[PDB]
Design a protein around this nucleic acid. Structure first.
Ligand SMILES: [Mg+2]
Ligand SMILES: [Zn+2]
Lengths: 79, 93, 263, 1091, 40, 105, 52, 71, 158
DNA sequence: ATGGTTGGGTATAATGGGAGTCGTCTCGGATGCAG
DNA sequence: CTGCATCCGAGAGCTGAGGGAACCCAACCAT
């Protein structure tokens, strides 16, 4: 199928972004009827929730990196 | 531009990983009052005021300098966090 | 329902909608308890339904409910939720922030590419807690409260406080932003150099990126607080680190206007 | 300094009074000075004669009205925040048809605001202006069908809120249909109602083809008129019981009732002219002897059929034509609001007549005047067309008074405007200035009246033309509308004349706006002057013909923002209109009659007229305008001086010897300078600051209130606890700063204590403000004429003055649209200087010229150089003024002076000048083989001089354009904009920082910015900004504590705005629940909302 | 912006949308112009 | 404190609404015109929504902390942080059912 | 460098019996050229008293 | 008040209304009575030409402690 | 670097180019009075001739600048790319050219004056149409582009 | 002990209201027509 | 039972700064 940008955006899985976009009453009533769960995949939902967006330094690929010097690493190795 | 930014960007596969490493190293330096630094006393970042040269209070510059020096090891799943912090406190109170 | 500074009262339309609903509900209960004929009960139920509709979505079926003496429709909960002025677009995707300022921009030809000229008063107001802590380190004030009272009045500020401020901002960067922000380059990080006067000094080579001129344009200044924010600003948002356009890959910070003429 | 003037066009008539559009309209609406027996039927008189008699029985009849004198003068109203108004009394008589007794009583109806001499109003102590509104004229129009070609739609339009629009259209089927109140139905029913037989319609519309065949319907025609009324009622109002009298009343009110439908004088005139028929009243039909009589429907149908059938002599209407658009001025809007209020008063009268005891009743008890006063207050306080008057300078007020707006109540909407409503129509020529208009979202919707235009009694803009007879231009001037203008060929004003005979074989002319070339015989009318094409603001730009329209627009708009200066000068190059502009603004003072001056003072002028009467004029001194600028009048006369009629007595703001003086004449050089004039920036010399150039006076008002509180009344007093004497030095014993004390941010102006046993609640100077306290005003309860709000005992106001000099960050502008911010102030020794040692004052970047195409500034600079060396000023009217040869001759004389001066002292040509002459010889600017003096003269005649660099002493490698330029400081000053905040007040609901400098607010980080933060990948910066800096209360408290304690800020939490969102979504009966990874509920409210 | 392979974690959707939208204001004039882009 | 990972939205039953509410609003009164204090059973009553002042009941019997969870016998107001006035809801019991317009229009 | 005038409280006032306001008086006085005949002299106060 | 205004031809003062009411009425009680007859205003009253500024957007919180006070 | 009025050199060829046009005009009128051309063809021919004249004037202006005054400020600004485009230079020196009515159709008479010579009232008034139309176009375009940018950001944000 | 508050009563006859809007475009259901 | 084909109603249209209409009558509860 092919749909314009507005209709493609309004058909997303996340009810938070769709509700904050346009046609708020329709999105909200459909989501409430369906009992939809928002998994917080995109950026707007995380911004609305005041969380760390899954991009840049907030990406799971990089945000768990640790840093340590050689002296402490050697001490842990002896331990 | 920050000195040696090109090398720092080439030292990592992703720039956000470099940013995370720099921020975490800066936090570690700030928490212990710059007593855990790996820089020699003549590589120390200086700042010039009327009274004289003192230590640079900005920890991010310290982190960039140490990352440039290459004496820091960084990666994923190196050491448990609790043990890491305890050992950090052991070497540098 | 709050008392304004002038002693008058200010209230939300939701209170009036709830009052109408409560009045109709109470009248319906009284009429039901009296065994009224079915025409009155039907009218009462219709009015209660209309009141509930007005509370939930005023101005959807029929003429919107208005306050007497005015033509302004009352704003229901949905009106609060939706629209350009609604909760989502006005308070969730965008907020007003602390540690920020705004001023007119002036050409900064003597600045380096990574530097911006910041007025002394703006820097003193923006970095006030850092300045208080650093003055505590020195002997300027015995405690933070004394530092705050001293910095409170303009004529109570001395010379060494300016040096303390200069030491505070050493190595740190601020974010400059010009509205409208059409691309990511509309926000950029700069090292502040303290200047006199009331105008922010901007490097000539970033004017094309900001789409800024000097016929009255104003720009806003923000201060990243934590170590993570400062690292992000210095490594990923430094002006000298953003030289090529993200859209085409061609240089975006380049000589323009007088520079080409001279060369 | 001598003034020399160019130009050949002679103006037969002078400019009309520039504020007449307001004054004449209001005077005609009020008719205050016309005796009641001779009052016409316009204005509020017409409203009175229309609403009355209030027929019920009893009949209340209007006899006459009068207006009393204002209770307080204008200045007293200004100080006490009162409205300058006059009481209105109407004398009425109540008669009883059954009895006969007449009770006559003059009833007070309320107050009507009075317009001052300059054309403004004083509403609640504030100066306000009513802006005229342009809208669609009432009448009958015919437009092409957009959907289907070859068919046309007829429209009948009344005045706004005076009836429904009625549409007529021939349906594809072939029958005609009328749409009213969005209800399509066949028109043949209404035609049958009005009493039309088949024979009449067939004879009247038969010739036009098959339309008349499709119009007849025997089912409808067979029905009698009354039955047709019932059928029409059931079609228009389905369900409503079809009573005979009720249907009569409904149909009468729809199209025949004078109190609901009213085609104005404009609509009547337009209908009569378009349809070639005669109206009896202002309605479409008449109800006489239980029968409807037609007035407009049959002519309209005839015109529609003729137009659809292609009969010659019938044309469609252009809805943007200025003959179909009209102007509602202040008087008409006020009269309409008065009519609404009078209708409400009529309702109240009728109700009281019904309910009141008929035995003991008088006109006074029946009439309640509250609705009329309420309507007038609403119109004069909340109407979008009533605007806070702009008085930055006299030109600002003059411009504002001539503004025409398409927006407002009943007007257009800014978001739904296309292109037809914003373009300059051909008929705008001489009626609306095509240049002056706002640049933002209001472009094309707000405009200005042309200089020579006059709005007639019907609302159509008229422009003047000279009558030409037999190729001879006469002195007769005819004011014509656009419709009349379309029928003639009008010659251009710049056509050559010898005596008064057109001395040109080919004449440029306009035919219905189309340019054409015609012989002198065919010309019927001639333009009066080029000045009539543009507005007053555009007429103040010299060399306007050398400027692109966009930059002329910018200059015209930006001349309004000029700030008055304490040393203002008139421009070196003027257009010759500054004296009329100053005179018509009522800013300066002129002698009423021939006389002699007796006393001169800084606040008073006493003149002895030849009548022997002494007349004293007080002078307004250091009075705060609405925009904070200081407007004062300074005497320009000496004791014993003889003054003729119209001679200047005192200079107004931004005026010098009766000439408009908005800025200063400064020496400018057009050259780049070290990047300090990069991208429109401007470099100025410190010599401007040394001699107090561009120094302005500004006044700020600070207001405080002492009211009643439950814990005790507020009180202004000197004794406030826990403040040292150093902050109470300047306060007097009454708690108010003494006059003349200097105040800085944080200083106390008015002391106040509130029951907390009391606490400090004084008013202090906000950050970034201050100056010298110049005035204090105290208004207490009980004072005559004082009307405070209930509960407030008294009010204290403080007026504080500032002397603002030019500084970096201030805005400067010329009259040609070149605007710039001061970027650098250099010492005098660093400025480029002439070989005689005179330094320049301003350096302008040449890169602003080639792409903006405003060449008028270059010609102004050349003429300014000539005037600087010749010591004179020049008048150069627009489109007929200084040309290149005249300026070259003037520059030749200026060079002769400039060089003979040097040569007399015994000096030759400098070596640096020789090098520059060699370089220019290589550049091809001078001819090789001439003496150095000849080359220098050639360069000077090209407007260029040898210039030296102040830092090195070496000359600039090429000759540089240098001359005098007129530059004005703009109201956008950086002092009023600079603002910063760390922490402050927060909003009630969202708990987010407030906005605005006054509230000590923070800057808004909008969606565009957040998107940029996301595009950089700066997740942590965004998270800090969205919680720790806006609405995470615990987060921001902990962040401030950690920063002041030296640690790093903690991790953020859920913002309060999301909690508000959850609470508001649950209130709509929607269960929003936050869950963790294991699908278990997570309580984000910390157990504060769980029972 | 760096003439090198893109880093993992870059929010390319926002960058793409901004990049497309930027020229449209003022750069694109007005079947043809901005209406064509909107229709597409 | 577990991290928030998903947000669910669903219809609310009358039982859910009654469990949300701390009490039924029976009167249309907002505040008293003399004392500027909330009226009993009104739209601002402190017994339903919480105290205006932190750790202080309406009648002043308790004005100190440590009384968390205690409801004053005279006034019926719990002693807790005043911020609970921005979280706690009330409810109105309709005599007859009414349709939610969102699902109708 | 300094001016004091009788019965005037600030620069933005007028003097009875005087055509010019105080601002213009300052502007005129700023054009005064004074020669000190003594090298050691550092400051002087000139006094003016006049009646119309 | 309206009857007094109609007969006298201008807005009456509080003392005249109090005198016209009779015994037990002074100007002070009349001011208080007019004071207590006031009705709250809407927080969403449009300010300025554009439909974006409301009255309630200019109302600060004076109850909750500021970050400086908490620290 | 400086800007004077004499720096906007008007080429001599322009005069000839105008006279030639005034020649063809007459021919065209003859071809319309004898039935060989209709209104539409004559209108198109006038537009074509004036367009070609404008292009030729542009070429002559720039050839003159390059051959006689290689260091002219306007020429240097245009050639270096610092500021200005050839159309603006042509309007400055040669002639403005054809103008559009508010209905969108061209006028029959062109603007034969440059900005250096000074315009008459009639040419200024006709050019006001294009100026106003461009301003209103900008005013609507900025809002429409903002709306498009918001929609694109919202559809691609994930 | 005191004012301010709360509910109840008034008897010729009195019997379907009243305000009103117009220069926008685009998208998706809804209804009625030919095949 | 398809397919067209209007026909009507619903919902949007840049940011930011700044915008200012009765009287009486008698019982009853809080404090
Ligand atoms: Mg700008
Ligand atoms: Zn209690």
């Amino acid at each position: 199928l092919l749909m314009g940008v507005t209709k493609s955006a309004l058909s997303t899985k996340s009810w938070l972004s769709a509700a904050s976009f346009q046609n708020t009453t329709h999105v909200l009533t459909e989501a409430a009827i369906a009992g939809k769960k928002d998994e917080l995949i995109g950026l707007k939902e995380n911004v609305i929730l005041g969380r760390l967006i899954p991009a840049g330094t907030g990406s799971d690929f990089v945000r768990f990196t640790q840093v340590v010097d050689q002296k402490t690493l050697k001490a842990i190795e002896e331990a | 531009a920050e000195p040696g930014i090109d090398k720092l960007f080439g030292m990592v596969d992703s720039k956000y990983r470099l940013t995370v490493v720099v921020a975490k190293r800066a936090q570690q330096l700030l928490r212990h009052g710059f007593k855990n630094t790996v820089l020699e006393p003549e590589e120390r970042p200086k700042m010039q005021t009327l009274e004289g040269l003192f230590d640079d209070p900005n920890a991010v510059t310290w982190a960039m300098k140490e990352l440039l020096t290459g004496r820091l090891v960084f990666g994923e799943n190196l050491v448990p966090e609790d043990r890491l912090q305890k050992e950090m406190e052991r070497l540098y109170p | 329902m709050v008392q304004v500074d002038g002693g008058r009262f200010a209230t939300s339309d939701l209170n009036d909608l709830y009052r109408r609903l409560i009045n109709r509900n109470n009248r319906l209960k009284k009429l039901l308890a009296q065994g009224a004929p079915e025409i009155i009960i039907r009218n009462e139920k219709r009015m209660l339904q209309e009141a509930v509709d007005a509370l939930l979505d005023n101005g959807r079926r029929g003429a919107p409910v208005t306050n007497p003496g005015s033509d302004r429709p009352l704003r229901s909960l949905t009106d609060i939720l939706s629209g350009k002025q609604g909760r989502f677009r006005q308070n969730l995707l965008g907020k007003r922030v602390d540690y920020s300022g705004r001023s007119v921009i002036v050409v900064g030809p003597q600045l380096k590419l990574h530097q911006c000229g910041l007025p002394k008063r703006m820097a003193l107001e923006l970095f006030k807690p850092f300045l208080l802590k650093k003055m505590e380190e020195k002997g300027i004030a015995p405690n933070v409260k004394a530092a705050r009272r001293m910095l409170e009045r303009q004529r109570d500020i001395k010379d060494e406080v300016w040096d303390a401020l200069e030491e505070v901002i050493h190595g740190k960067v601020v974010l400059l932003n010009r509205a409208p922000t059409l691309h990511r380059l509309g926000i950029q990080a700069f090292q502040p150099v303290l200047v006199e006067g009331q105008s922010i000094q901007l490097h000539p080579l970033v004017c094309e990126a900001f789409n800024a001129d000097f016929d009255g344009d104003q720009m806003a200044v923000h201060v990243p607080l934590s170590s993570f924010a400062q690292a992000e600003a210095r490594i990923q948002m430094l002006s000298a680190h953003n030289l090529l356009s993200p859209a085409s890959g061609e240089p975006l910070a380049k000589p323009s206007r007088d520079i080409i003429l001279g060369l | 300094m001598e003034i020399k003037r160019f130009g050949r066009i002679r103006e037969v008539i002078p400019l009309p009074p520039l504020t007449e559009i307001q004054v004449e309209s209001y005077r005609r609406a009020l008719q205050a000075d016309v005796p009641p027996e001779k009052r016409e039927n316009v204005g509020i008189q017409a409203a009175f004669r229309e609403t009355f008699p209030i027929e019920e029985g009893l009949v209340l009849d209007f006899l006459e009205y009068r207006l009393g004198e204002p209770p307080f003068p204008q200045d007293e109203c200004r100080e006490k925040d009162l409205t300058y108004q006059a009481p209105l009394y109407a004398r009425l008589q109540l008669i009883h048809k059954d009895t006969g007794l007449i009770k006559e009583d003059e009833v007070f109806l309320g107050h009507i605001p009075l317009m001052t001499e300059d054309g403004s109003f004083i509403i609640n102590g504030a100066d306000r202006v009513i802006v005229s509104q342009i809208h669609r004229s009432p009448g009958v129009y015919f437009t092409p069908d957009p959907a289907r070609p070859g068919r046309y739609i007829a429209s009948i339009i009344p005045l706004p809120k005076r009836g429904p629009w009625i549409d007529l259209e021939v349906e594809p089927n072939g029958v005609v249909s009328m749409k009213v109140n969005k209800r399509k139905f066949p028109l043949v029913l209404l035609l049958r109602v009005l009493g039309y037989d088949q024979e009449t319609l067939a004879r009247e519309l038969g010739a036009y083809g098959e339309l008349v065949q499709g119009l007849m319907d025997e089912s409808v025609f067979a029905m009698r008129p009354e039955e047709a009324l019932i059928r029409l009622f059931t079609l228009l109002r389905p369900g409503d019981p079809p009573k005979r009298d009720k249907a009569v009343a409904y149909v009468y009110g729809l199209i025949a009732d004078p109190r609901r439908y009213d085609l104005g004088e404009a609509g009547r005139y337009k209908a009569e002219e378009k349809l070639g028929i005669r109206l009896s009243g202002r309605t479409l039909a008449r109800f006489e002897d239980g029968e409807f009589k037609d007035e407009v429907f049959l002519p309209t149908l005839r015109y529609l059929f003729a137009l659809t059938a292609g009969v010659p002599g019938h044309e469609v209407d252009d809805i943007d034509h200025l003959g179909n658009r009209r102007i509602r001025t202040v008087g008409e809007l006020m009269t309409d609001q008065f009519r609404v209020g009078l209708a409400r008063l009529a309702r109240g009268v009728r109700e009281r007549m019904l309910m009141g005891s008929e035995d003991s009743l008088t006109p006074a008890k029946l009439v309640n005047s509250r609705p009329l006063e309420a309507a007038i207050r609403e119109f004069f306080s909340r109407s979008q067309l009533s605007q806070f008057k702009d008085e930055t300078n006299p030109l600002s007020s003059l411009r504002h008074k001539r503004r025409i707006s398409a927006l407002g109540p009943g007007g257009l909407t800014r978001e739904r405007a296309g292109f037809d409503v914003r373009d300059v129509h051909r008929t705008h020529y001489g009626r609306i200035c095509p240049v002056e208009t706002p640049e933002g979202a209001n472009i094309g919707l707000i405009t200005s009246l042309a200089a020579y235009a006059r709005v007639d009694e019907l609302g159509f803009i008229r422009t003047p033309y000279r009558r030409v007879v037999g190729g001879v231009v006469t002195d007769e001037v005819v004011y014509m509308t656009a419709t009349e203008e379309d029928r003639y060929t009008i010659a251009q004003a710049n056509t050559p004349l010898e005596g008064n005979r057109i001395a040109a074989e080919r004449v440029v002319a306009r035919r219905k706006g189309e340019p054409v070339i015609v012989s002198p015989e065919e010309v019927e009318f001639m333009d009066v002057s080029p000045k009539q094409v543009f507005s007053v603001n555009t007429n103040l730009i010299p060399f306007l013909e050398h400027d692109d329209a966009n930059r002329a627009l910018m200059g015209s708009n930006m001349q309004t923002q000029a700030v008055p200066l304490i040393r203002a000068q008139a421009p070196v190059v003027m257009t010759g209109l500054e004296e009329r502009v100053v005179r018509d603004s009522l800013a300066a003072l002129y002698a009423e009659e021939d006389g002699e001056v007796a006393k001169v003072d800084g606040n008073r002028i006493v003149v002895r007229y030849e009548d022997g009467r002494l007349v004293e004029y007080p002078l307004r001194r250091f009075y705060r305008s609405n925009q904070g600028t200081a407007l004062d009048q300074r005497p320009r006369v000496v004791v014993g001086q003889r003054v003729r009629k119209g001679d200047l007595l005192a200079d107004g703001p931004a005026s010098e010897n009766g000439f408009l003086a908005l800025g200063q004449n400064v020496l400018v050089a057009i050259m780049p300078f070290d990047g300090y004039n990069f991208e429109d920036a401007i470099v100025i010399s410190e010599e401007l600051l040394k001699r107090d150039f561009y120094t302005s006076i500004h006044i700020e008002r600070y207001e405080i209130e002492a009211r009643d509180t439950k814990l005790g009344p507020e009180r202004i007093t000197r004794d406030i606890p826990h403040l040292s004497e150093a902050a109470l030095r300047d306060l007097d014993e009454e708690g108010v700063v003494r006059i003349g004390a200097e105040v800085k941010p944080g200083d106390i102006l008015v002391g106040r204590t509130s029951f907390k046993d009391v606490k400090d609640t004084s008013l202090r100077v906000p950050p970034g403000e201050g100056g010298i306290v110049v005035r204090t005003v105290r208004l207490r309860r009980g004072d005559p004429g004082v009307e405070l709000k209930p509960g407030v005992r008294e009010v204290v106001r403080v007026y504080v003055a500032q002397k603002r000099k030019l500084q970096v960050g201030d805005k400067l502008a010329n009259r040609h649209g070149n605007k710039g911010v001061v970027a650098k102030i250099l010492p005098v020794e660093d400025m480029p200087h002439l070989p005689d040692g005179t330094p320049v004052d301003v350096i302008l970047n040449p890169l602003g010229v080639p792409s903006r195409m405003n060449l008028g500034q270059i010609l102004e600079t050349h003429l300014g150089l000539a005037g600087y060396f010749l010591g004179q000023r020049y008048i150069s009217p627009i489109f007929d003024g200084a040309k290149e040869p005249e300026i070259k001759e003037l520059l030749a004389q200026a060079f002769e002076v400039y060089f003979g001066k040097r040569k007399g002292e015994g000096f030759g040509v400098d070596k640096r000048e020789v090098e520059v002459l060699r370089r220019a010889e290589k550049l091809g600017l001078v001819t090789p083989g001439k003496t150095p003096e000849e080359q220098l003269k050639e360069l000077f005649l090209q407007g260029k001089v040898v210039l030296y660099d102040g830092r090195t002493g070496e000359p600039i490698e090429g000759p540089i354009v240098v001359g005098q330029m007129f530059i004005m400081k703009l109201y956008h000053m950086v002092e009023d904009k600079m603002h910063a905040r760390s922490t402050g007040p927060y909003s009630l609901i969202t708990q987010q920082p407030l906005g605005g400098k006054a509230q000590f607010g923070g800057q808004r980080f909008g969606e565009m910015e957040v998107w940029a933060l996301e595009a950089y990948g700066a997740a942590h910066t965004l998270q800090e900004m969205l919680t720790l800096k806006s609405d995470d209360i615990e987060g921001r408290n902990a962040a401030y504590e950690a920063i002041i304690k030296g640690e790093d800020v903690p991790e953020p939490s859920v913002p309060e705005s999301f909690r508000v969102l959850v609470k508001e979504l649950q209130a709509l009966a929607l269960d929003v629940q936050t869950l963790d990874e294991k699908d278990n509920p997570v309580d984000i409210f910390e157990g504060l909302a769980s029972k | 912006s760096m003439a090198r392979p893109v880093s993992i974690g870059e929010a390319v959707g926002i960058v793409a949308a901004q990049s497309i939208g930027e020229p449209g204001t003022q750069l694109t004039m007005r079947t043809q112009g901005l209406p064509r882009v909107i229709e597409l | 404190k577990k991290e928030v990972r998903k947000v669910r939205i669903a219809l609310a039953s009358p039982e859910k609404i009654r469990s949300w509410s701390y009490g039924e609003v029976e009167k249309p009164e907002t505040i008293n015109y003399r004392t500027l204090k909330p009226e009993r059973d009104g739209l601002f009553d402190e017994r339903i929504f919480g105290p205006i002042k932190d750790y202080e009941c309406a009648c002043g019997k308790y004005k100190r902390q440590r009384f968390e969870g205690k409801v004053c016998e005279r006034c019926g107001v719990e002693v807790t942080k005043s911020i609970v006035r921005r979280y706690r809801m009330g409810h109105i019991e309709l005599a007859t059912p009414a349709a939610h317009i969102w699902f109708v229009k | 460098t300094s001016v004091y005038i009788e019965d005037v409280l600030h620069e933005f006032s007028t003097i009875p019996g005087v055509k010019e306001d105080v601002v213009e008086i300052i502007l005129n006085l700023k054009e005064l050229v004074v020669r000190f005949l003594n090298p050691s002299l550092q400051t002087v106060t000139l006094l003016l008293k006049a009646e119309g | 008040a309206r009857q007094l205004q109609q007969e006298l031809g201008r807005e009456p003062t509080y003392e005249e209304i109090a005198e016209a009411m009779g015994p037990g009425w002074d100007a002070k009680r009349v001011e208080e009575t007019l004071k207590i007859a006031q009705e709250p205003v809407s927080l969403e009253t449009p300010i300025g030409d554009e439909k974006d500024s409301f009255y309630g957007d200019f109302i600060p919180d004076e109850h909750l402690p500021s970050p400086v006070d908490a620290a | 670097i400086t800007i004077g009025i004499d720096d906007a050199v008007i080429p001599e060829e322009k005069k000839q180019y105008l006279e030639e046009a005034d020649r063809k005009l007459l021919q065209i009128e003859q071809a319309y009075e004898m039935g060989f051309l209709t209104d539409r063809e004559r209108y198109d021919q006038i537009l074509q001739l004036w367009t070609e004249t404008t292009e030729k004037v542009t070429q002559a202006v720039f050839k003159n600048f390059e051959e006689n005054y290689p260091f002219n400020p306007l020429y240097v600004m245009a050639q270096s790319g610092a500021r200005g485009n050839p159309q603006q230079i042509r309007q400055l020196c040669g002639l403005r050219g054809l103008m559009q009515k508010p209905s969108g159709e061209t006028f029959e008479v062109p603007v034969r004056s440059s900005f250096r010579e000074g315009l008459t009232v009639l040419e200024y008034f006709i050019s006001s149409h294009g100026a106003r139309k461009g301003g209103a176009d900008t005013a609507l375009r900025t809002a429409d582009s903002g709306y498009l940018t918001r929609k694109l950001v919202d559809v691609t944000h994930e």
